[PDB]
Design an enzyme around this catalytic site. Structure first.
Site, short mmCIF file in Angstrom:
data_model
loop_
_atom_site.label_atom_id
_atom_site.label_comp_id
_atom_site.label_asym_id
_atom_site.label_seq_id
_atom_site.Cartn_x
_atom_site.Cartn_y
_atom_site.Cartn_z
N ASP A 50 7.35 -2.84 -14.16
CA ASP A 50 6.96 -1.72 -13.34
C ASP A 50 7.88 -1.60 -12.11
O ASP A 50 8.76 -2.44 -11.87
CB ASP A 50 5.51 -1.86 -12.87
CG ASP A 50 4.50 -1.74 -14.00
OD1 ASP A 50 4.82 -1.27 -15.11
OD2 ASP A 50 3.34 -2.14 -13.75
N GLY A 59 10.55 3.40 -7.00
CA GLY A 59 11.51 2.71 -7.85
C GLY A 59 12.96 2.79 -7.43
O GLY A 59 13.80 2.12 -8.05
N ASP A 109 6.44 -12.86 -6.26
CA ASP A 109 5.82 -11.64 -5.80
C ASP A 109 5.93 -10.53 -6.85
O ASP A 109 6.96 -10.39 -7.52
CB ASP A 109 6.52 -11.22 -4.51
CG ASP A 109 6.09 -9.89 -4.00
OD1 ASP A 109 4.97 -9.84 -3.46
OD2 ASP A 109 6.85 -8.90 -4.13
N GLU A 152 1.94 -13.64 -8.77
CA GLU A 152 0.93 -12.67 -8.34
C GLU A 152 1.02 -11.46 -9.26
O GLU A 152 1.91 -10.62 -9.11
CB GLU A 152 1.10 -12.27 -6.88
CG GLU A 152 0.10 -11.22 -6.42
CD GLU A 152 0.75 -10.04 -5.69
OE1 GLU A 152 2.02 -9.97 -5.57
OE2 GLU A 152 -0.01 -9.16 -5.24
N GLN A 196 -3.41 -5.61 6.75
CA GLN A 196 -3.48 -4.66 5.66
C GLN A 196 -4.92 -4.42 5.11
O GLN A 196 -5.30 -3.34 4.78
CB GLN A 196 -2.54 -5.03 4.49
CG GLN A 196 -1.12 -5.34 4.93
CD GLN A 196 -0.17 -5.45 3.69
OE1 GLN A 196 0.12 -6.52 3.19
NE2 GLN A 196 0.21 -4.32 3.18
O1 LIG Z 1 12.61 2.61 -2.06
C1 LIG Z 1 11.32 2.14 -2.38
C2 LIG Z 1 10.31 2.79 -1.48
O2 LIG Z 1 10.69 2.59 -0.15
C3 LIG Z 1 9.80 3.09 0.84
O3 LIG Z 1 8.59 2.35 0.77
C4 LIG Z 1 7.95 1.73 1.89
C5 LIG Z 1 6.42 1.88 1.83
O4 LIG Z 1 6.03 3.24 1.93
C6 LIG Z 1 5.73 1.08 2.95
O5 LIG Z 1 4.31 1.01 2.82
C7 LIG Z 1 6.26 -0.34 3.00
O6 LIG Z 1 5.76 -1.12 1.93
C8 LIG Z 1 5.21 -2.47 2.13
C9 LIG Z 1 3.76 -2.49 1.61
O7 LIG Z 1 3.03 -1.50 2.31
C10 LIG Z 1 3.16 -3.88 1.77
O8 LIG Z 1 1.85 -3.96 1.24
C11 LIG Z 1 4.03 -4.98 1.13
O9 LIG Z 1 3.95 -5.03 -0.30
C12 LIG Z 1 4.03 -6.29 -1.03
C13 LIG Z 1 2.77 -7.20 -0.97
O10 LIG Z 1 2.31 -7.43 0.38
C14 LIG Z 1 3.09 -8.46 -1.86
O11 LIG Z 1 2.18 -9.57 -1.82
C15 LIG Z 1 3.36 -7.97 -3.33
O12 LIG Z 1 2.31 -7.21 -3.94
O13 LIG Z 1 4.47 -7.13 -3.37
C16 LIG Z 1 4.38 -6.00 -2.52
C17 LIG Z 1 5.74 -5.37 -2.66
O14 LIG Z 1 6.84 -6.24 -2.31
O15 LIG Z 1 5.37 -4.82 1.51
C18 LIG Z 1 5.97 -3.54 1.38
C19 LIG Z 1 7.44 -3.56 1.83
O16 LIG Z 1 7.59 -3.84 3.19
O17 LIG Z 1 7.67 -0.41 2.95
C20 LIG Z 1 8.30 0.25 1.88
C21 LIG Z 1 9.79 0.06 2.02
O18 LIG Z 1 10.21 0.39 3.31
C22 LIG Z 1 9.44 4.55 0.61
O19 LIG Z 1 8.39 4.93 1.52
C23 LIG Z 1 9.06 4.82 -0.84
O20 LIG Z 1 8.86 6.21 -1.11
C24 LIG Z 1 10.13 4.28 -1.78
O21 LIG Z 1 9.78 4.54 -3.14
CA LIG Z 2 10.81 -3.52 -11.52
#
Ligand SMILES: OC[C@H]1O[C@H](O[C@H]2[C@H](O)[C@@H](O)[C@@H](O[C@H]3[C@H](O)[C@@H](O)[C@@H](O[C@H]4[C@H](O)[C@@H](O)[C@@H](O)O[C@@H]4CO)O[C@@H]3CO)O[C@@H]2CO)[C@H](O)[C@@H](O)[C@@H]1O
Ligand SMILES: [Ca+2]
Ligand SMILES: [Ca+2]
Length: 415
Positions: A151, A156, A190, A216, A302
């Site tokens: 995914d 993406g 992750d 995870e 969060q």
């Molecule tokens: O180019 C890809 C995308 O980039 C931009 O995305 C943003 C998001 O909108 C933000 O919310 C943020 O994302 C956070 C996220 O909110 C947070 O929960 C965390 O995710 C982890 C999680 O904690 C972990 O345990 C596991 O499940 O994996 C998750 C993913 O790694 O971290 C995120 C990243 O900091 O930031 C992103 C990137 O700046 C853009 O808005 C999108 O449209 C685009 O597709």
């Molecule tokens: Ca992938």
């Protein structure tokens, strides 16, 4: 500390781990550039509290920012440089050395699925059009495509092709680097829905075969297509299938789903309660993490799926007395005052010899959850939110009280 894989080759490092999640979501804001220093100072205390392992934040520097607000926590790293928002490279080495020296193995959160492709100043610069990125191929939706066999993260646009030999090797070499230079005893993978589980097995075989690992997988049945057997499967079946293919323990989101949605009695339907030891021994149980739970600081963190405070003690008593491998959240232990209770339960677990494959039987006829757990040294009777009066109602033998908290809502007796 026993090492060793499971009978099925799963990397549960002897089944005897007790893990601390060594951060919360807002650490980079609450203790700017100082977290590794804090962990170094706290290493001896963490060890004395009974932990065998610590899950470290993503060590790859993250200077991302977005607006709720956030960024910098490690899940949108831009390269493998360790001079990030948790502390310097030197401070990481000192913290990992102090933790290891105290007997606490160091597990690094690693994030192979994606990176901060757009960050202007970074050491890893992968152009388009060579197959390095998911969106080098057509990308019609959140499902595998010809450049990404899992995914995608949000849109993406930042997903890596982890199966590309150069990208696979990039991560293989960095896992080796964490083992040789930063004291890694294992890894937390992750967002494992984002790439093939067999690739985790390969990475671990290449770079850390005897280490601990955990993945995870947070993906419920409804997120799979109608033709996929997982669309009508249990949460247990889904995460167990991942573990089988990765040869790696898996976070027990089946138990978390029951804690959030079901009754206390229903907690018996987590992976860690499964009567097949090959099933329950691969579960990595937890109460909350940096995603599901609150954190100190901005917006309360969060809190995407947080356990209410009226069940926190019960949940820790369950995971610390039961099979699977338990994880304790930093903020419950060291911010919010559950430390003394958790310390006592860790001692109960160790004194009883409960391990990942210990047998657990659930008893009918009472309110709440009533279980008997067969540790290597002692049998435990555990009664949570129950009208059970005494352990002789449900077990043969002589028992003494080990835990009695929350007006009897948490009781544990031991043989
Ligand atoms: O180019 C890809 C995308 O980039 C931009 O995305 C943003 C998001 O909108 C933000 O919310 C943020 O994302 C956070 C996220 O909110 C947070 O929960 C965390 O995710 C982890 C999680 O904690 C972990 O345990 C596991 O499940 O994996 C998750 C993913 O790694 O971290 C995120 C990243 O900091 O930031 C992103 C990137 O700046 C853009 O808005 C999108 O449209 C685009 O597709
Ligand atoms: Ca992938
Ligand atoms: Ca071990």
């Amino acid at each position: 500390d026993q090492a060793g894989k499971s009978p099925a080759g799963v990397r549960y490092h002897g089944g005897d781990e007790i893990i601390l999640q060594g951060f919360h979501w807002n650490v980079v804001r609450e203790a700017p550039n100082d977290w590794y220093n804090i962990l170094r100072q706290q290493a001896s205390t963490i060890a004395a509290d009974g932990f065998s392992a610590i899950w470290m934040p993503v060590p790859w520097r993250d200077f991302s920012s977005w607006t709720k607000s956030g960024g910098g926590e490690g899940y949108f790293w831009h390269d493998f440089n360790k001079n990030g928002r948790y502390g310097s490279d030197a401070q990481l080495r000192q913290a990992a050395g102090a933790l290891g020296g105290a007997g606490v193995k160091v597990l690094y959160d690693v994030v192979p699925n994606h990176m901060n492709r757009g960050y202007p100043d970074k050491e890893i610069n992968l152009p388009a059009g060579q197959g390095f990125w998911r969106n080098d191929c057509a990308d019609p939706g959140n499902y595998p495509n010809d450049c990404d066999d899992g995914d995608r993260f949000i849109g993406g646009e930042s997903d890596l092709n982890t199966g590309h030999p150069q990208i696979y090797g990039m991560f293989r070499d960095e896992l080796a680097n964490l083992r040789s230079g930063y004291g890694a005893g294992g890894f937390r993978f992750d967002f494992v829905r984002g790439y093939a589980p067999e690739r985790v097995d390969s990475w671990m075989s290449d770079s850390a075969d005897s280490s601990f690992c955990v993945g995870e997988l947070w993906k419920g049945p409804s997120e799979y297509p109608s033709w996929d057997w997982r669309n009508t499967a249990s949460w247990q079946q889904i995460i167990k299938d991942w573990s089988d293919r990765a040869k790696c323990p898996v976070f027990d989101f089946a138990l978390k789903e029951r804690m959030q949605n079901g009754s206390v009695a229903d907690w018996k339907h987590g992976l860690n309660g499964n009567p097949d030891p090959r099933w329950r021994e691969v579960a990595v149980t937890f109460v909350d993490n940096h995603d599901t739970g609150y954190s100190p600081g901005q917006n309360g963190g969060q809190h995407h799926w947080a356990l209410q405070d009226g069940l926190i003690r019960q949940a820790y008593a369950y995971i610390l007395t039961s099979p699977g491998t338990p994880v304790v959240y930093w903020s419950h232990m060291y911010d919010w005052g559950y430390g003394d209770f958790i310390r006592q339960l860790i001692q109960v677990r160790r004194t009883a010899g409960v391990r990942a494959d210990s047998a657990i039987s659930f008893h009918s006829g009472y309110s709440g959850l009533v279980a008997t757990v067969s540790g290597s040294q002692q049998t435990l009777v555990v009664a949570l939110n129950s009208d059970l009066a005494n352990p002789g109602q449900v077990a043969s033998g002589s028992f003494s009280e080990a835990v009695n908290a929350s007006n009897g809502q948490v009781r544990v007796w031991r043989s």
